[PDB]
């Protein structure tokens, strides 16, 4: 009775060829907000295409939210340069072929960058306004691995940055063609409304795309 000690999910997804998305986790633990965000990301890019890296060394499976485990989250306490040690199935993370999505970069990501990078890295950061520039910690941590690219001049949530990167790289849509809304207001009644100071991508109904559950969380907050 050893037959469950396997890596079938990995065998089933290979051989690797497709762009991957890596989130360097940079929050303590997993708040409800983070869980909803990461759940949405998993659903949009596919569990086989996401890695959550740099978790604290003491992290074990019980510390990972069951909602994320159920959606297939691949997670590791290794940093970017140790990911290949844990996940032997992934393509090598090659110097210069790993793109840091960096709000301060001087050059915006473009569809032709699909040819130029195999991995796209995001800070798992709940941003502040004004931004605290915490993404810069990644640039200093991996100075020869990463090349920075921008997603326009306003801050996006992690799931929005990944959604935008997928539209540019996978769907080959130029940034200037993506329909965004800057700093949307969410109003529910005369007593309850909240602005979110990020840039969001719009769905075909003209509404900002939020993780499932997030509008409920914003409504619960406004009701307090
Ligand atoms: C909410 S943001 C955090 C930004 C962080 N507060 C800062 O000022 O560096 C989450 C992640 O999505 C990516 N991101 C968000 N907005 C971006 C932009 N305008 N350009 C490039 N990457 C962006 C970055 O990888 C970032 O770490």
Describe this structure in words.
It comes from Saccharomyces cerevisiae (strain ATCC 204508 / S288c) (Baker's yeast). Its EC number is 2.1.1.-. Belongs to the class IV-like SAM-binding methyltransferase superfamily. Protein arginine N-methyltransferase SFM1 family. With 224 residues, the chain is an alpha/beta fold. The chain has one domain (8-173): 3-Layer(aba) Sandwich (Alpha/beta knot), CATH 3.40.1280. Helix content is 25%, strand content 18%. It is built from seven helices and ten strands. The strands form three sheets. It has a six-stranded parallel beta sheet with strand order 3-2-1-5-4-6, covered by helices on one side. A two-stranded antiparallel sheet has the order 7-10. Strand 1 (20-25), helix 2 and strand 2 (50-53) form a beta-alpha-beta unit. Helix 2 packs parallel to helix 6 (158-169). The chain is globular, with a radius of gyration of 18 Å. The protein starts with 7 loop residues before the first helix and ends with a helix. The relative contact order is 0.15. Bound molecules: S-adenosylmethionine.
Distance between the termini: 53 Å
Tally the helices: what do you get? 7
Bound molecules: S-adenosylmethionine
Broad structural category = alpha/beta
What is the domain total for the residues?
1
Q: How many beta-strand runs?
A: 10
Overall shape: globular
Approximately how much beta-strand content do the residues carry? 15-25%
Instruction: Determine the CATH topology.
Output: Alpha/beta knot
Major sheet: 6 strands, parallel
The share of residues in helices is 25-40%
Please give the radius of gyration in angstroms: 18 Å
Spatial sequence of strands, sheet with the most strands: 3-2-1-5-4-6
H/E series, N to C?
HEHEHEHEEHEHEEEEH
The CATH architecture comes to: 3-Layer(aba) Sandwich
